[PDB]
Amino acid sequence: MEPVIIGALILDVHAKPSTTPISGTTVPGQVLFAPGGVARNVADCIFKLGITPFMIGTLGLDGPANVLLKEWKLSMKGILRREDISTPIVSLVYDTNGEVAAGVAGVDAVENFLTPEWIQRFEYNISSARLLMVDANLSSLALEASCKLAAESSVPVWFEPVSVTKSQRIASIAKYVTIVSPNQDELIAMANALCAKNLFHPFLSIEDMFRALKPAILVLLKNGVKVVIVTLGSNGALLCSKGNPKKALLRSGEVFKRVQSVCSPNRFSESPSLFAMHFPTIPAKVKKLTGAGDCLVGGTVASLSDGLDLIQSLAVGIASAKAAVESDDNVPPEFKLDLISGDAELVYNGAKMLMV
- What residues make contact with ligand FJF under the rule CB under 6 A? 8, 10, 12, 26, 36-38, 41, 90, 105, 107, 137, 162-163, 166, 290-291, 293-294, 330
Interacting span for Na ion (CB under 5 A) from 113-121, 173-181, 243-251, 323-331: 323-331
Region of 312 (left: φ > 0; alpha: ψ -120 to 50; beta: rest) is: alpha
Of the pair 23, 205, the CB lying nearest a second copy is at 23
User: For the chain, what's the residue count?
Assistant: 356
Please choose, out of 103-111, 225-233, 250-258, 320-328, the segment that lies near Na ion by the rule CB under 5 A.
320-328
Instruction: Report the residue from 74, 138, 321, 337 that binds ligand ADP according to the rule CB under 6 A.
Output: 321
Report the residue from 50, 224, 233, 253 that binds ligand ADP according to the rule CB under 6 A. 233
Residue at 329: amino acid letter: D
Question: Beta-carbon neighbour count of residue 138 at 10 Å?
Answer: 31
Residue 327's binding partner, choosing from Na ion, ligand ADP, a second copy, none, with beta-carbon cut-off 5 to 8 A by kind? Na ion
Alpha helices in 223-336 (DSSP H): 254-262, 292-305, 310-325
| Distance (Å, whole) CA 306 – CA 253 | 6
- Contact (Cβ atoms closer than 8 angstroms) between residue 164 and residue 36: no
Residue 265 near which of ligand FJF, ligand ADP, a second copy, none (CB within 5-8 Å, type-dependent)? none
Among ligand FJF, Na ion, ligand ADP, none, residue 237 binds (CB under 5-8 Å by kind)? ligand ADP
User: Among residues 48, 226, 278, 288, which is the contact residue for Na ion, using CB under 5 A?
Assistant: 288
320 close to 45: Cβ distance less than 8 angstroms:
yes
Cα distances (Å, whole numbers) of residue 86 to 17, 63, 111, 334: 28, 10, 12, 29
User: Rounded CA gap, 356 and 352, in Å?
Assistant: 9
CA 14 to CA 120: how far, in whole Å? 34
Which residues of the chain form contacts with ligand ADP (CB under 6 A)?
183, 231-234, 236-237, 281-282, 284, 286, 289, 292-293, 296, 318, 321-322, 325
Which residues of the chain form contacts with a second copy (CB under 8 A)?
11, 13, 15-17, 19, 21-33, 62-64, 66-67, 70, 86, 89-93, 95, 99-108, 163-166, 185
